[PDB]
């Protein structure tokens, strides 16, 4: 027991040193090279672990069922079960045996080749064969490809077949002026460090038809991840990149020369799409002949993933933004299917995954509009579109009378003189404002007064019946919506601002479509759904059915009334109930009013579609309503 406990400590340190990848520290715990001792020296044990555990990508060696006895006077026998993770999976239940050595006051391990793998003997070799699994596809609700693996036309140049002098200058100009490529980049690619005279230097990937090949140009069809919608769904789908040496260290089950999802659904579903690597890890004889198989299973390709996205609605919603900063969400509000998740501006995922220069990558990250942001998953102030929620809350608790008319004089209003130089501002000087007039003209002073009349307690009681604080069950990384920073406003000004969707509210467009869905389900909140096979989840009795059948008739007037803020949508001639809205943000980059334009619209007859669009930091004379004409027509025809 005095030395049997110190012997178990030596086995614990030897296993730990192998687990931490430091094989030299484990080799120094072995006895000298002999017949009754260790079979190899210091550096020989090191190189054997570094080769075998390195080729199989062994990681995470942990043991159990450790038992150390006593064979001779200076020899203790140990044994333990162990498991490890390799390139082909898990090595469950491995019976290890060995003997210790209590020479002097330092116990060592009589190392044998059976400590690498159980049934290894002498000069036994280890081989590993692997077959890479094809990445699964991402399809829409109708089977259209959003992210598939197919053949790509690769344009390249051979420097030897270009010209010895003078002729090479005309061909580089003949290739740059025929494939829409930089004239100074074709010369730089053929003059890198890795380039040889007779090599094939790749350049650009031809998307559609291929033009005529000048002197030196040639096409070589290669395979790779292709995104048909391109930038129209870049933030949602994402892109895949080359797997690095450190990516394998975190997960040894990745292909050593495969593709790994870097963002979006390609990364959130990287396990379901990459499949599993097939092959065999076998111990062989000294002559190279097979002996014992440790792991073996066939290659299993990745499973396809079907979304609720509509490829046509996704491209229309993105193109309607015209490259401006903004986002658009289209849903079927009765089931929760996300028809389109557009974010603009965007980046090219095909150029991203098929070799991108670091100059074009710097343009993406240095763009002040930030095309890498998934704006449908970024928290914003909902804007004065939120006046629907504050009105519906006000109708349930009996605070707001739909027929009561407030008298508002001017464009600015403050409660008391204690507000200092702050005033709630409206755009239309309407003297007699009731609830219907406040929703048509988008009056902030009306809801600002009705919120203070309602009080903070009754306001939050109605607000807490929504999805504030909840984490939506979606494969999209996002933060939960919040009413404010703390559990109390502690400010009449902050309370009034929250009334018309300002203040410290933070709700991303996906969460907005969830809350606004109560107007298409008689007050029942329907949670959004991205995967097609998911079950519809709902939250009944968020607002009263009385408040819905009172606001929705008024929301029709926001489109039909000649002074309605969404009157330009009445040109469509379709049954529409909409609600506009703006939000003024005070950013510090250029001290000036950055205003965000919002639009919410849905079909009030069949509740077939629902849309929430936004223009971030909008230009002058621009709005989300000016751009929603095309998407609303498509959703009205195909989602009745």
TrEMBL record:
Record-linked InterPro entries: Beta-lactam/transpept, Beta-lactam/transpept-like, MecA_N, NTF2-like_dom_sf, PBP_dimer, PBP_dimer_sf, PCN-bd_Tpept
UniProt keyword Signal present: no
One example GO MF annotation: penicillin binding
Residue stretches making up the NTF2-like N-terminal transpeptidase domain: 8-124
All copies of domain Penicillin-binding protein dimerisation, residue ranges: 131-291
Record's keyword terms, sorted: Membrane, Transmembrane, Transmembrane helix
Domain Penicillin-binding protein transpeptidase: 326-626
Annotated compartments: Cell membrane
Protein name in UniProt: Penicillin binding protein 5
Lineage per the UniProt record: Bacteria, Bacillati, Bacillota, Bacilli, Lactobacillales
Gene encoding the protein: pbp5
